[PDB]
């Protein structure tokens, strides 16, 4: 009775299909999952994808001549829309095929089994709003520490903790812990819940999605917050959902120190370059040696079979002299996540974790032998050291 017939602007269409196509699976056991769902009605077109784990859905303006729904190959539609000329795109469902016309280019794709296509999950009740940029930044700063699929499930996720208008993101891989606290706007009072989101999915949603100024997080309301089984993210005309992890996150807080025996403040860029130079001779990028004394940092690394490098930097150091080694890659990951012009290190023992956090004027107001109370910060990158011979 009704077959979708719609006219669209190329940019809106190609961009929408592009964003939705990122959540598409490759060679899924369920063929229909490889399709993109197009639903045109009133004066808009909705473009959707789903893989039983992540859902992507975006609505764009559209000139509807006939509403309807159709399921077409996702990657193929994405490629076509990329390659279309900057002209109006006419889409018309005809029988078992879908005509797509743009200028002189004409495509005829076969329709997929929209009957066997699963229903998209409905986002839980809205829980709060978060500034888009800050949310994406926090995610980026924490995801660096998340474990990869090789490790246990609990480590492959970003823990999202909400307590009123303050939320904390945490991720660890058993060697580095990243924690970021930020302020948000809760649409429910005195909420207190914690969930575990797949780190890859959340980081992806941050990099590619999260358009606009504010982002609405949907985990539920009242007591059902976080118990709905999925995280919803709505921003502008985009909405996505992610299945949550059932695994329980480690009690990461009892890894953080209360005081430091030594403190060291230095410029992020300077330290990063020096680390990148010295690390070129580490046997497997495995170990860089840091020697703090007076106000000097002696970096070193290497073997006699590969080579031996070293470099001295000026450092604002206070406390007991220290010699501690780290993984060069892990170290540069932390420094890269700080997003500060200057870093402060908090040390206890060469065999215990080190605290990497942005520097503050208070740090420059220290001149005692220690110990030093662990200051409160918005972001912390705790890095476990490497044993020394």
């Amino acid at each position: 009775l009704t077959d979708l017939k719609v006219r669209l602007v190329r940019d809106d269409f190609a961009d929408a299909v592009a964003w939705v196509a990122r959540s598409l699976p490759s060679r899924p056991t369920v063929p229909v999952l490889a399709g993109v769902l197009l639903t045109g009605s009133d004066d808009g077109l909705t473009i959707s994808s789903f893989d039983y784990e992540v859902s992507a859905e975006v609505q764009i303006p559209a000139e509807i001549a006939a509403p309807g729904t159709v399921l077409v190959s996702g990657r193929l539609l994405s490629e076509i829309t990329r390659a279309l000329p900057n002209k109006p795109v006419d889409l018309s469902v005809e029988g078992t095929r879908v005509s797509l016309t743009c200028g002189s280019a004409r495509f005829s794709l076969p329709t997929m089994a929209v009957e066997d296509y699963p229903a998209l999950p409905e986002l839980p009740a809205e829980t709060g709003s978060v500034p888009a940029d800050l949310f994406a930044e926090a995610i980026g700063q924490v995801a660096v520490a998340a474990g990869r699929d090789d490790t246990l499930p609990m480590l492959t996720g970003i823990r999202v903790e909400i307590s009123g208008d303050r939320m904390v993101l945490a991720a660890t891989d058993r060697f580095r812990l990243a924690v970021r606290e930020l302020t948000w706007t809760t649409k429910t009072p005195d909420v207190e819940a914690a969930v575990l989101v797949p780190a890859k999915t959340l980081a992806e949603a941050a990099k590619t999605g999260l358009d606009g100024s504010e982002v609405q997080l949907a985990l539920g309301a009242g007591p059902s917050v976080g118990q709905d089984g999925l995280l919803g993210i709505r921003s502008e005309g985009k909405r996505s959902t992610t299945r949550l992890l059932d695994a329980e996150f480690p009690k990461f807080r009892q890894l953080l120190p209360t005081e430091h025996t030594a403190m060291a403040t230095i410029g992020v860029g300077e330290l990063t370059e020096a680390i990148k130079r010295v690390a070129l001779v580490a046997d497997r990028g495995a170990q860089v040696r840091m020697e703090f004394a007076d106000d000097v940092l002696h970096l070193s690394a290497g073997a006699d079979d590969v080579g031996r490098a070293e470099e001295d930097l000026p450092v604002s150091f206070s406390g007991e002299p220290l010699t501690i080694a780290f993984n060069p890659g892990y170290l540069t990951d932390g420094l890269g996540a700080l997003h500060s012009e200057r870093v402060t290190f908090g040390f206890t023992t060469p065999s215990k974790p080190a605290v990497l956090r942005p520097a503050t004027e208070a740090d420059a107001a220290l001149n005692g032998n220690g110990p030093f109370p662990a200051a409160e910060t918005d972001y912390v990158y705790l890095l476990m050291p490497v044993r020394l011979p």
Partner: peptide, 6 residues
């Protein structure tokens, strides 16, 4: 390399 826990 040492672990944070375990």
């Amino acid at each position: 390399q040492l672990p944070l826990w375990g």
